[PDB]
Structures are given as structure tokens and as C-alpha cells.
Amino acid sequence: TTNYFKVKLLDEKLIPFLGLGERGPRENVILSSNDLASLKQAGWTVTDVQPLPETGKIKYDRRTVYFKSEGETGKFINVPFYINPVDARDVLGLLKFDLIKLSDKSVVKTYTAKDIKSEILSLPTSDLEVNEEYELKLYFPKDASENYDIAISEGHKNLFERVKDSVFIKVKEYGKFTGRLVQLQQDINVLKESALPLDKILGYKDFDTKEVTPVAKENLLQLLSVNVSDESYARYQADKNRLLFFSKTGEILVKVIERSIQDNIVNFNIRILDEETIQNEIDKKIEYSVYDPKDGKFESI
Amino acid sequence: TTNYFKVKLLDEKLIPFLGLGERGPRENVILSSNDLASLKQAGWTVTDVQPLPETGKIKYDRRTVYFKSEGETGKFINVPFYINPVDARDVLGLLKFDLIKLSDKSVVKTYTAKDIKSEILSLPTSDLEVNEEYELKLYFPKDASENYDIAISEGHKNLFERVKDSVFIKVKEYGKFTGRLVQLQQDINVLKESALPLDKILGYKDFDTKEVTPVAKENLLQLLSVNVSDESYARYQADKNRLLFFSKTGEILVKVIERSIQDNIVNFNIRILDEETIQNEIDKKIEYSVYDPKDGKFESI
Amino acid sequence: TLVGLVQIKEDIAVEGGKVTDYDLFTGLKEGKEVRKGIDRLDRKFKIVE
Numbered sequence: 001t002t003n004y005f006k007v008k009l010l011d012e013k014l015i016p017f018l019g020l021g022e023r024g025p026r027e028n029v030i031l032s033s034n035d036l037a038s039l040k041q042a043g044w045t046v047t048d049v050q051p052l053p054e055t056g057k058i059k060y061d062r063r064t065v066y067f068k069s070e071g072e073t074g075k076f077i078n079v080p081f082y083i084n085p086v087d088a089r090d091v092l093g094l095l096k097f098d099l100i101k102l103s104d105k106s107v108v109k110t111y112t113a114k115d116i117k118s119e120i121l122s123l124p125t126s127d128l129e130v131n132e133e134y135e136l137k138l139y140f141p142k143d144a145s146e147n148y149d150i151a152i153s154e155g156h157k158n159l160f161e162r163v164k165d166s167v168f169i170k171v172k173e174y175g176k177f178t179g180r181l182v183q184l185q186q187d188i189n190v191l192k193e194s195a196l197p198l199d200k201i202l203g204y205k206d207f208d209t210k211e212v213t214p215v216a217k218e219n220l221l222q223l224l225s226v227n228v229s230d231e232s233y234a235r236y237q238a239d240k241n242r243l244l245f246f247s248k249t250g251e252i253l254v255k256v257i258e259r260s261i262q263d264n265i266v267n268f269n270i271r272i273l274d275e276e277t278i279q280n281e282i283d284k285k286i287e288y289s290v291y292d293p294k295d296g297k298f299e300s301i
Numbered sequence: 302t303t304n305y306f307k308v309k310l311l312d313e314k315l316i317p318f319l320g321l322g323e324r325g326p327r328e329n330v331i332l333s334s335n336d337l338a339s340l341k342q343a344g345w346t347v348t349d350v351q352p353l354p355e356t357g358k359i360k361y362d363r364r365t366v367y368f369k370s371e372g373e374t375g376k377f378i379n380v381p382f383y384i385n386p387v388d389a390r391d392v393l394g395l396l397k398f399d400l401i402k403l404s405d406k407s408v409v410k411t412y413t414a415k416d417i418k419s420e421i422l423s424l425p426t427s428d429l430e431v432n433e434e435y436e437l438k439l440y441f442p443k444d445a446s447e448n449y450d451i452a453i454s455e456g457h458k459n460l461f462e463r464v465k466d467s468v469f470i471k472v473k474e475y476g477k478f479t480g481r482l483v484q485l486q487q488d489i490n491v492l493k494e495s496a497l498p499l500d501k502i503l504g505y506k507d508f509d510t511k512e513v514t515p516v517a518k519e520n521l522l523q524l525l526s527v528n529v530s531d532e533s534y535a536r537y538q539a540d541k542n543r544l545l546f547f548s549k550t551g552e553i554l555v556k557v558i559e560r561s562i563q564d565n566i567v568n569f570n571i572r573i574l575d576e577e578t579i580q581n582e583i584d585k586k587i588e589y590s591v592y593d594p595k596d597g598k599f600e601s602i
Numbered sequence: 603t604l605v606g607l608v609q610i611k612e613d614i615a616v617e618g619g620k621v622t623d624y625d626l627f628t629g630l631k632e633g634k635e636v637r638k639g640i641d642r643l644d645r646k647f648k649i650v651e
Contacts, residue, residue, distance in 0.1 A: 001563060020603055051563070069419050076377055087479040087562060088508035118370050118475050174419050178388040207389035261388060262302060262352075 001051070002085050003033035004159045006148065008048035016042075017151045029149045030159060052091060055084040056113075056138040056163040064167065067174040068125060076122040079136065079167070083113060094144040094160075097121060100135035102168075113138070125171070134169040173219035179204025181224075181256065181264040184214060185298060188270040189290040190245055198226070198241040200296055202256060202266060215241075223260060229253035233272065245272050302352070303386050304334035305460045307449065309349035317343075318452045330450045331460060353392060356385040357414075357439040357464040365468065368475040369426060377423040380437065380468070384414060395445040395461075398422060401436035403469075414439065426472070435470040474520035480505025482525075482557065482565040485515060486599060489571040490591040491546055499527070499542040501597055503557060503567060516542075524561060530554035534573065546573050607644070608635045612651075 007029055009015060014023040017035050030052065031039070039046050059080035066077060086092055095113035100106070108127055121136075128134065140160040150158045182205045190196055198221070203214040215221060218241070226236040228243070229252045235244040236254075243254065249272040258264035278290065282301070289298040308330055310316060315324040318336050331353065332340070340347050360381035367378060387393055396414035401407070409428055422437075429435065441461040451459045483506045491497055499522070504515040516522060519542070527537040529544070530553045536545040537555075544555065550573040559565035579591065583602070590599040611629040615621065626643060630636045 014604070016604055018603070020609055067419060074375060074377060075379075075421075075423060076375060078376075078379065085563065118368060120376075122376060262386065 002054040004030060004052040004054055005033070005036050006030050006048075006050045006052055006089075006091070007036065007046050009039075010045045010047060018149065022149070026149055028147065029151065031151050035151055050089060051085045052089075052159055053083050053086045053095065054159070054163055055082065056095065056165055057082065058136070058138065058165045058167055060167050062167045063170065065170045065172065066125065066128070068128060068130060068171050069174045072126050075125050077125060077169075079121040079123060080119065081113075081116075081121055081138075082119055088114060091144075094140060096139060096141060098135075098137050098139065099123065100137060101129070102133040102135050108134075123169075128169070128171045131172050134171060135166055136169065137166045138164050140164070175219045175223065176260055177204055177215075177220050178207045180261070181205075181258050181266050182212060183266060183268070184212070187288055188268055189288060190270060190272055191290065191293070192245065192247065192249055192272060192274045194245050194291070194293045195237075195242045196245070196270075196291055196293070197296075198224070198243075198256075200291075201268065223258055225257045225259065227255040227257065229255075234270070243270075249273055249277070303355040305331060305353040305355055306334070306337050307331050307349075307351045307353055307390075307392070308337065308347050310340075311346045311348060319450065323450070327450055329448065330452065332452050336452055351390060352386045353390075353460055354384050354387045354396065355460070355464055356383065357396065357466055358383065359437070359439065359466045359468055361468050363468045364471065366471045366473065367426065367429070369429060369431060369472050370475045373427050376426050378426060378470075380422040380424060381420065382414075382417075382422055382439075383420055389415060392445075395441060397440060397442060399436075399438050399440065400424065401438060402430070403434040403436050409435075424470075429470070429472045432473050435472060436467055437470065438467045439465050441465070476520045476524065477561055478505055478516075478521050479508045481562070482506075482559050482567050483513060484567060484569070485513070488589055489569055490589060491571060491573055492591065492594070493546065493548065493550055493573060493575045495546050495592070495594045496538075496543045497546070497571075497592055497594070498597075499525070499544075499557075501592075502569065524559055526558045526560065528556040528558065530556075535571070544571075550574055550578070610643070 008027040009029050010025045012024050015026055015029070017031070017038070018029075027048075036046065036049070059082060083092070083095065092114035093112060097111035097113055097116065099108040099110070101108055111121065123136070140163070145158055145160040150160075152158050182203055183201070184203045185201055188196075188201060199214045199216055203212050205212060215224070221241050226243075228234050228236060230248075233246060233248045233250065233252050234254070235246070236242075237244060252270050252272065254268040254270055256264075256266040256268070273290070287300060289300045292299045309328040310330050311326045313325050316327055316330070318332070318339070319330075328349075337347065337350070360383060384393070384396065393415035394413060398412035398414055398417065400409040400411070402409055412422065424437070441464070446459055446461040451461075453459050483504055484502070485504045486502055489497075489502060500515045500517055504513050506513060516525070522542050527544075529535050529537060531549075534547060534549045534551065534553050535555070536547070537543075538545060553571050553573065555569040555571055557565075557567040557569070574591070588601060590601045593600045608630065610626050614624060614626075627636050627638060632638060
């Protein structure tokens with residue numbers, strides 16, 4: 001049951017509860033329940049009483065996260081919805097679904113709520129984009145309230161301005177790699193003021209075939225909580241995948257932790273060294289490699 | 302973390318915690334956590350410690366109802382599942398999904414739990430049958446425990462006999478018609494001992510186009526809670542759609558109620574009459590119709 | 603809208619930037635609502651738009 005009825009008034013004295021004028025036998029006159037019971041009691045021949053949809057709710061949680069893979073054939077997400085006090089009227093041709101992309105506020109595709117059979121909305125995910133928030137609404141269009149004589153006040157909300165429900169689909173990458181997070185280089189020696197990317201110091205051992213490919217694809221890096229020993233010596237950039245070696249030189253412990261698989265605590269013993277820390281020991285035949293940031297490969301001489 | 306590990310024992314003295322014999326360096330020896338910590342402490346060279354999947358749970362409610370329409374293209378139901386303490390091993394090739402039809406206990410299709418990417422099982426409903434209960438299990442096959450030396454008792458449950466999770470998919474018709482449940486015949490007069498079907502006394506007024514087609518299709522009848530006035534006069538068969546007129550004759554009120562749409566209270570004033578109630582008033586020109594059960598149409602003379 | 607005073611008409615053509623001596627009792631029917639040259643306009647007058 002509701003409190004909004006599309007009726008057909010058939011007296012011609014003067015319609016009360018409305019604006020100035022509007023006296024004749026009027027149809028499509030959307031009234032309240034407090035309104036309608038004060039006209040049936042007032043000796044009016046108000047007929048064709050049809051209830052109107054005040055329930056446009058969605059049976060779904062709002063802010064969902066949808067991890068989307070690369071190869072996506074079909075994979076329809078089913079959204080349950082229900083519009084209760086109606087089955088098929090002229091107003092249900094006005095109820096619209098819409099997939100608003102919240103990045104730039106444009107719809108992807110729209111559906112009419114009376115043609116979606118079985119009360120289940122099967123949204124395709126072949127058209128959804130990655131790392132962009134979406135919106136699924138039950139808005140009435142702004143040109144729906146024009147064809148009806150709604151009996152409201154100035155500051156009250158009419159029916160078409162009232163019923164709506166919106167959920168929020170977050171479509172991001174799946175990620176969640178398979179690996180033990182193996183290292184890629186022992187004896188990490190870096191210069192004094194330089195930057196070292198993570199894709200040349202650590203990789204991951206794939207469990208299907210034992211490959212030692214590094215972390216090149218970046219949607220895996222947010223699960224890697226990199227932790228340095230001292231804050232003043234080095235610092236991990238989060239927007240990039242680099243460490244920031246400041247003026248202080250010495251030993252640091254860089255603890256790379258992956259949260260999904262248990263026991264991915266990776267420890268790097270990184271030695272920060274100056275310019276002339278190299279030349280006083282290149283003569284006494286201490287052969288080891290120091291990372292060269294201009295080309296990425298580790299060099300010794 | 303779990304308490305079941307597939308290890309590789311490499312001492313050859315005598316394996317304890319196992320059966321008679323079994324002394325050599327054994328591999329694929331599934332041990333407990335209470336077991337394994339009593340061998341690492343016992344000076345054993347137990348290596349290749351791999352944790353085993355003790356979580357095969359489904360992130361889904363068990364006894365769901367899936368209303369299936371006639372035209373079904375795609376409409377994949379997504380079932381969330383997770384197998385926690387593993388990513389890709391030799392045991393995950395043994396974990397099997399299966400769609401057991403519970404009517405005759407036969408699978409529709411099976412899936413391996415390590416090939417279902419993104420931890421979402423998209424079951425098709427194009428192959429599901431109507432009004433038949435289903436089952437989706439995480440059973441290990443009975444020929445999976447053969448290739449491992451499980452260290453259990455007689456009456457304890459090994460790992461492959463342990464982890465499983467089953468949900469129950471009920472696939473029935475959608476139904477939920479669009480109509481006001483209009484009558485089809487006024488002045489219902491029936492004989493003394495007869496039966497009157499519901500598809501010739503009531504119909505429903507479709508809201509798309511105003512058709513007065515009766516309730517022929519039977520998956521709508523369970524929403525119609527037919528209520529008679531007196532129990533001893535007539536009785537509504539639930540398995541059929543008929544009323545059962547007994548020896549008592551007179552006025553009865555048959556209240557047909559539809560629960561989905563509001564205000565579908567339909568009232569039939571049915572008059573039960575004898576054999577010679579007809580002939581004493583056919584001469585005094587009381588012309589009306591009495592239902593003839595041999596052909597279904599209402600006849601007067 | 604059954605009781606209460608009479609509403610005057612809203613829009614006023616001020617083409618050219620100004621109009622002089624424009625009567626506000628246009629569109630109101632004579633006799634019942636307004637008697638021309640007899641009743642006055644009330645002091646709750648304001649423009650809203």
C-alpha cells in the first residue's frame with residue numbers, strides 16, 4: 001500500500017488541494033492518501049484509483065567491489081531489485097535504470113524497469129572499466145512529472161522527485177598473484193643519493209611453472225607493504241615502486257610483506273655508500289656490485 | 302594456517318605415528334601439526350613442508366530459491382568460494398566442484414577448484430531443471446586419499462574425508478502474474494455431487510493488454526489461497542484446482558485471495574442444488590445456467 | 603485556494619526597459635473579482651522574479 005494515487009476526478013466545480021484555477025473534470029491527478037480520503041469523504045466522484053510506485057529500492061549492498069580480470073566473456077553481475085505496489089502501468093514505462101560512470105558522469109547503458117523480467121538485473125561487465133567507480137540508479141527522468149497534476153506544496157517533494165536508490169560498483173583489477181616473493185639480487189649496494197625500483201630487486205616464484213619473473217605489473221604492488229628499518233635513511237615511495245636513499249649511509253633492513261599468502265616476509269640488507277667509499281676499496285680488490293640507476297643493471301666496475 | 306602438512310620424511314630408521322612397517326624415507330606423508338612438531342623436535346630431517354587446504358567453504362547461503370523463467374539465455378548465477386591456505390599444488394587438482402541433481406543423484410557438470418579463476422563460480426542456469434533441488438559440493442573424490450600416507454587413527458577423519466561444503470539450489474518457476482483476478486462467470490450454480498475447476502470460474506485481467514484469459518498455467522495456482530465459507534459443504538482440492546461439492550446444498554462463499562498484489566479478494570456466490578431442484582423450476586420459467594461437469598461449459602437447458 | 607484574496611496576474615511586459623501606467627488588474631474578470639476604479643491593491647505587493 002502507498003500514499004500516492006493517480007486518479008481521475010470527474011466533478012467540475014473546483015478542484016481543491018491544487019493551484020489557482022484548475023476547476024474542471026481532471027484526469028492524471030496524482031493525490032496523497034490524506035488528499036484522496038478528503039475527497040471521497042467530500043462527495044466527489046473520484047474514480048480510476050490506481051496506486052503508484054513508492055518503492056524503487058534495490059535489494060543489494062551499495063558500495064561493492066568487483067574484481068575484474070582481463071579475459072571477461074559474459075560474467076554478468078546479477079542485481080536484485082523490486083518495485084512493489086505496481087505490476088504494469090503507464091508510470092512503469094518511466095522508471096529507468098542507468099549505469100552512471102562516476103568518473104565523468106555519463107551513462108553506459110540504460111534499462112526500463114518494467115522490461116527487466118524476473119526482477120533480476122544482469123549487468124554485463126564486458127563494458128565496465130577498471131579503477132573507475134560506477135552508479136546504478138532508479139531515477140525518474142525530469143520530464144516525467146510534466147504530464148500529471150501533482151497536488152503538492154512548494155517545498156514538498158513530489159513522487160517523481162522522491163523514489164530513487166543508488167548503489168556503487170567499484171571495478172578494479174583482480175591481482176592476488178601466486179608466489180613466495182623470492183629475491184632477485186643479493187648484496188644490494190646503492191649509491192648515496194639515488195633511487196632503486198622494486199622490479200629489479202625482488203620477484204615472485206610462480207607455482208604453476210617455477211618462473212622468477214619480477215613484479216612488472218603494478219596492480220600487485222598495493223598488496224606489498226614495504227617497510228624500511230630507519231625512516232631517515234631511506235623511504236619507500238607509494239605512488240612509485242622506488243626507495244629514496246637520502247644523505248645518511250649505512251645498513252638498512254627493507255622488510256617486504258605480502259598480506260595474502262602466509263610467510264612472505266622478505267628481508268633485504270641494503271648498504272648505502274658514498275662516492276669515495278668505492279674508490280678506496282677498488283684498489284684492495286673487494287669485488288662486489290653496486291646498483292647503477294642510469295641503466296638499471298647491477299655493475300661492479 | 303592449518304594442522305595438516307604434506308611433508309617429505311628423509312630418515313630411514315622407522316617412521317613413528319604410522320602403521321606397522323613403513324620405515325624408510327617416505328614422501329607425501331600427510332601429518333598433523335601435533336604430529337609434525339613431535340618429529341621436528343625428535344631430530345628428524347622432515348622437509349618439503351607444504352600446508353594443505355583445510356578450508357573448502359563456500360561464501361554463499363545454502364538453501365536458496367532460484368526462480369527460473371522460460372526464456373533463459375545466459376543468466377549465470379555467481380557463487381563465491383574460497384580455498385584459503387593454498388594457491389596451486391598437487392592437491393588442488395583433486396578438489397572438485399559438482400552440480401548434483403538431488404532428484405536422482407547425478408552430476409550435471411563438474412569443475413576443478415583450481416581452474417575456476419577469480420574465486421567466483423558462474424553456474425549456468427540454461428541446464429537447470431524446474432522444481433528439482435540441486436546441490437553444489439566441495440567433495441574430494443574417494444580415489445584422492447590413495448596416493449598419500451595419512452597418519453590417522455582408525456576412527457579419525459583424514460583430510461580428504463574432512464573438507465566439504467554443500468549448498469542447495471531450488472530451481473522453480475517464476476510465476477507472479479499481472480492481473481486483478483477478475484471473475485469469468487456470474488451466478489455459479491452447480492449440481493449436488495460434482496467438481497468445478499478453477500480455470501472456468503475465474504481469470505485475470507492482464508495489465509499490458511486487457512485480456513481475460515483464465516488461469517490455465519498451474520504455477521500461478523499456489524499463490525491463490527482459495528477459502529470456502531463452510532467446510533462441510535464444499536472443499537478445495539490443493540493438488541488439483543477443483544472444488545468438491547458434497548451432499549449439503551445451499552449458499553457458499555468462495556473467497557479467492559492472491560497474496561502478491563494488494564486487494565485481490567474475489568468472492569463467488571455459489572449455489573449448490575439437487576437433481577429435482579432443476580425440474581420444479583424449469584416449468585415456472587426461471588432461466589439461469591447450471592455448470593455441466595461433463596463438458597465444462599455452463600448450460601441452461 | 604477556496605478562500606483568501608484574489609491573485610493578480612504575474613507577468614508584465616517591460617519591453618524597452620520601462621513601461622508607464624501599466625494596470626495590474628488585467629486578466630481579472632470584472633464585477634466578481636475586481637471593480638475597476640473602486641478597490642485598491644494591497645500593501646503586500648512585491649516582485650519575486
